[PDB]
Amino acid sequence: LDPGLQPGQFSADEAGAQLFAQSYQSSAEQVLFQSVAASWAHDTNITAENARRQEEAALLSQEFAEAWGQKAKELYEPIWQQFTDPQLRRIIGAVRTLGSANLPLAKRQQYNALLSQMSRIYSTAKVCLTCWSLDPDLTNILASSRSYAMLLFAWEGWHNAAGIPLKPLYEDFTALSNEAYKQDGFTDTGAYWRSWYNSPTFEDDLEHLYQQLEPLYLNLHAFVRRALHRRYGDRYINLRGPIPAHLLGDMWAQSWENIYDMVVPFPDKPNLDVTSTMLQQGWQATHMFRVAEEFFTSLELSPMPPEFWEGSMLEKPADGREVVCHASAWDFYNRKDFRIKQCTRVTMDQLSTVHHEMGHIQYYLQYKDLPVSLRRGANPGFHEAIGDVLALSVSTPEHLHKIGLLDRVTNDTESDINYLLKMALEKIAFLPFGYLVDQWRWGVFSGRTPPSRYNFDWWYLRTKYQGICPPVTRNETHFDAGAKFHVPNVTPYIRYFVSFVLQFQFHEALCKEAGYEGPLHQCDIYRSTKAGAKLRKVLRAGSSRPWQEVLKDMVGLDALDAQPLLKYFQLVTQWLQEQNQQNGEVLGWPEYQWHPPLPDNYP
Ligand SMILES: *[C@@H]1O[C@H](CO)[C@@H](O[C@@H]2O[C@H](CO)[C@@H](O[C@@H]3O[C@H](CO)[C@@H](O)[C@H](O)[C@@H]3O)[C@H](O)[C@H]2NC(C)=O)[C@H](O)[C@H]1NC(C)=O
Ligand SMILES: *[C@@H]1O[C@H](CO)[C@@H](O[C@@H]2O[C@H](CO)[C@@H](O)[C@H](O)[C@H]2NC(C)=O)[C@H](O)[C@H]1NC(C)=O
Ligand SMILES: *[C@@H]1O[C@H](CO[C@@H]2O[C@@H](C)[C@@H](O)[C@@H](O)[C@@H]2O)[C@@H](O)[C@H](O)[C@H]1NC(C)=O
Ligand code: PRO
Ligand SMILES: [Cl-]
Ligand SMILES: [Zn+2]
């Protein structure tokens, strides 16, 4: 570590701590930036050499965090919690946590290399028949193929190709991650992740939330299973059993909007899937981003800077380069460079993703002048909710009409049901999955789930919550959790469950602030500068203040609350409930053991 990056001398009182924090900040931007840059160079161009460079950058980051971490502990570890500047408390709090910097040198290297190798495995995995990539090839098949056998080949091929080789590395990563964070005072890595929400009752609170949301999920599930039964027959669909995991339009069955055309209750109404219109109008990735950008500026939030357009990767490279296609938003910590890396496809659901990612960027733009340690969301769920809130307005038939993607719908009860169903397939279907992923990972981190039970416990949770079953037999050679991006890429997941609840709280508060007075689900906050000012306040706060306070200022409540979500969906909730009772549906999957047979002569 260069002497210019070393911590100097500071007094052991609150005054000296302010100077310490300032000095940290003065050096941290350079170190964080070199690391984000190397990560970028790798993720947009996966090679052995770029991985080597990224790891080298990661090592320097760890060295810097060690030097300043230890100095913070030495000087302030007792007294810092009693400092009366809450922002300073948060900075010191952040700096004293070394994470992987706690590992001895050889283990830091092992850890850094594991991250590289798991990332490589997931993002370069292919299914050969030459060979299909996840994005766009297998994504497209799962989205639009209605051949049972073809869907199965894609689902099984993907889970096999991505999951199996990840398992040994993931075991090694879990052990090292735990060793690292134990030194920071946490029982395991999961405990560290959960600490970001600063709630002694976090897990209970999520459980209570889910209890309220579950009946909506059960009704949607029963309704969709009925349609699937009509399409695929009694051989492949059990009306009292879990749904085969490959039939819901999505590799992870995490969102079901791609099977909308199968379940659209009133087809004679205008087609709410505007994809073919985007295609006919010649929309490209770049136009999707401009359209998203303009919504932000309509709220008097920030446009994307030139560095964003010049630096971002908005399409899958045509040069055959290997990239991490999974959409992400990047803060380079230099207050100038902000980027999105997305293998953008021209679809309606991709348009929503563009908004999601740009929500992240907008947060970055708004809090770029805070000290580095405070450049985070009020909690990670806040960061995930921003773009989704705007996307709720964009999805409304009225907004789609405003932007030339839809002919004015008859504002009647049946148009409402269509729309709320399409939204339910996207938002309600996700809830059990958003909830279960970190439950699996928390179990792994605590040792409750050893490698010998990785798949057993994954499918337990997948069945328990989503009511799905694998369409082919799985065993512990398979590592099906590994075939979902966030696991090998070590990105926490509970943020999304939190987000999916919170975004409806945001939507309600912003719509009220916008002076809108109709039904919640028909709200469009486009061009509300009052709604923009309210959202801006949240964004500029970063992690400077307790999330409960920031939420109170915004929404009038200091807690996550399912009621705004329920109010938004109430009409389709009622309707689905009636369709299910009239069809004599069983709510749930009491034949919990059931799996479908193989298609004739597979493969
Ligand atoms: C589509 O049609 C629905 C009717 O099914 C319209 O919803 C209605 O919108 C009006 C006007 O915003 C609402 O009246 C308002 O009531 C509040 C008090 O509740 C009052 O403070 C306001 O002054 C205003 O008069 C009405 O509540 C609402 N009706 C229902 C049943 O929700 C909707 O406006 C139409 N949407 C579009 C986009 O054209
Ligand atoms: C992808 O990454 C590789 C490195 O793994 C890049 O290859 C280097 O490019 C520089 C600058 O043009 C050359 O001078 C070097 O000879 C290359 N270095 C090595 C170690 O091979 C490559 O340019 C990157 N591709 C793209 C499209 O950015
Ligand atoms: C786990 O299963 C592996 C392959 O699965 C088998 O073949 C597929 C196509 C299905 O028909 C399935 O029922 C079969 O089990 C086996 O190669 C492997 O031996 C199994 N691993 C262990 C550790 O038992
Ligand atoms: O794709 C995923 O898994 C998460 C959830 C929605 C946004 N990104
Ligand atoms: Cl999180
Ligand atoms: Zn996100």
PDB file of all heavy atoms in Angstrom, residues 196-197 380 492 494-495, ligand 5:
ATOM      1  N   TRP A 196     -27.791  -4.874   7.465  1.00  0.00           N
ATOM      2  CA  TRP A 196     -28.054  -3.694   6.637  1.00  0.00           C
ATOM      3  C   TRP A 196     -29.457  -3.098   6.839  1.00  0.00           C
ATOM      4  O   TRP A 196     -29.694  -1.940   6.503  1.00  0.00           O
ATOM      5  CB  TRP A 196     -27.881  -4.017   5.143  1.00  0.00           C
ATOM      6  CG  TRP A 196     -26.517  -4.498   4.711  1.00  0.00           C
ATOM      7  CD1 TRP A 196     -25.302  -4.133   5.228  1.00  0.00           C
ATOM      8  CD2 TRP A 196     -26.237  -5.411   3.638  1.00  0.00           C
ATOM      9  NE1 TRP A 196     -24.281  -4.781   4.555  1.00  0.00           N
ATOM     10  CE2 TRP A 196     -24.830  -5.569   3.575  1.00  0.00           C
ATOM     11  CE3 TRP A 196     -27.038  -6.114   2.728  1.00  0.00           C
ATOM     12  CZ2 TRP A 196     -24.211  -6.403   2.636  1.00  0.00           C
ATOM     13  CZ3 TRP A 196     -26.426  -6.948   1.804  1.00  0.00           C
ATOM     14  CH2 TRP A 196     -25.022  -7.080   1.759  1.00  0.00           C
ATOM     15  N   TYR A 197     -30.391  -3.889   7.353  1.00  0.00           N
ATOM     16  CA  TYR A 197     -31.747  -3.394   7.550  1.00  0.00           C
ATOM     17  C   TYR A 197     -31.973  -2.825   8.948  1.00  0.00           C
ATOM     18  O   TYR A 197     -33.014  -2.223   9.221  1.00  0.00           O
ATOM     19  CB  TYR A 197     -32.767  -4.475   7.186  1.00  0.00           C
ATOM     20  CG  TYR A 197     -32.726  -4.769   5.708  1.00  0.00           C
ATOM     21  CD1 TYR A 197     -31.840  -5.723   5.189  1.00  0.00           C
ATOM     22  CD2 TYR A 197     -33.519  -4.047   4.819  1.00  0.00           C
ATOM     23  CE1 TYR A 197     -31.780  -5.981   3.835  1.00  0.00           C
ATOM     24  CE2 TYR A 197     -33.471  -4.297   3.462  1.00  0.00           C
ATOM     25  CZ  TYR A 197     -32.600  -5.257   2.974  1.00  0.00           C
ATOM     26  OH  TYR A 197     -32.552  -5.487   1.629  1.00  0.00           O
ATOM     27  N   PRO A 380     -30.874  -1.771   1.091  1.00  0.00           N
ATOM     28  CA  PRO A 380     -30.751  -2.243  -0.290  1.00  0.00           C
ATOM     29  C   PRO A 380     -32.081  -2.361  -1.050  1.00  0.00           C
ATOM     30  O   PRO A 380     -32.084  -2.253  -2.263  1.00  0.00           O
ATOM     31  CB  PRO A 380     -30.066  -3.606  -0.131  1.00  0.00           C
ATOM     32  CG  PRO A 380     -29.267  -3.448   1.124  1.00  0.00           C
ATOM     33  CD  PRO A 380     -30.224  -2.704   2.029  1.00  0.00           C
ATOM     34  N   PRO A 492     -26.928 -10.334  -2.813  1.00  0.00           N
ATOM     35  CA  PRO A 492     -28.021 -10.631  -1.882  1.00  0.00           C
ATOM     36  C   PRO A 492     -29.369 -10.463  -2.589  1.00  0.00           C
ATOM     37  O   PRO A 492     -29.464  -9.690  -3.550  1.00  0.00           O
ATOM     38  CB  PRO A 492     -27.830  -9.585  -0.773  1.00  0.00           C
ATOM     39  CG  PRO A 492     -26.355  -9.271  -0.833  1.00  0.00           C
ATOM     40  CD  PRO A 492     -26.065  -9.252  -2.307  1.00  0.00           C
ATOM     41  N   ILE A 494     -32.830 -10.624  -0.728  1.00  0.00           N
ATOM     42  CA  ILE A 494     -33.988 -10.174   0.074  1.00  0.00           C
ATOM     43  C   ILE A 494     -34.399  -8.734  -0.262  1.00  0.00           C
ATOM     44  O   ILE A 494     -35.580  -8.371  -0.156  1.00  0.00           O
ATOM     45  CB  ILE A 494     -33.774 -10.393   1.600  1.00  0.00           C
ATOM     46  CG1 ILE A 494     -35.110 -10.372   2.362  1.00  0.00           C
ATOM     47  CG2 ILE A 494     -32.804  -9.387   2.195  1.00  0.00           C
ATOM     48  CD1 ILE A 494     -35.986 -11.578   2.094  1.00  0.00           C
ATOM     49  N   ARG A 495     -33.417  -7.942  -0.704  1.00  0.00           N
ATOM     50  CA  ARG A 495     -33.638  -6.616  -1.294  1.00  0.00           C
ATOM     51  C   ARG A 495     -34.803  -6.566  -2.295  1.00  0.00           C
ATOM     52  O   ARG A 495     -35.531  -5.568  -2.349  1.00  0.00           O
ATOM     53  CB  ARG A 495     -32.355  -6.116  -1.981  1.00  0.00           C
ATOM     54  CG  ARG A 495     -31.827  -7.014  -3.101  1.00  0.00           C
ATOM     55  CD  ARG A 495     -30.451  -6.558  -3.566  1.00  0.00           C
ATOM     56  NE  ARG A 495     -29.528  -6.428  -2.430  1.00  0.00           N
ATOM     57  CZ  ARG A 495     -28.251  -6.087  -2.535  1.00  0.00           C
ATOM     58  NH1 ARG A 495     -27.707  -5.855  -3.744  1.00  0.00           N
ATOM     59  NH2 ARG A 495     -27.517  -5.985  -1.431  1.00  0.00           N
TER      60      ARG A 495
HETATM   61 CL    CL B   5     -30.134  -7.126   0.637  1.00  0.00          CL
END
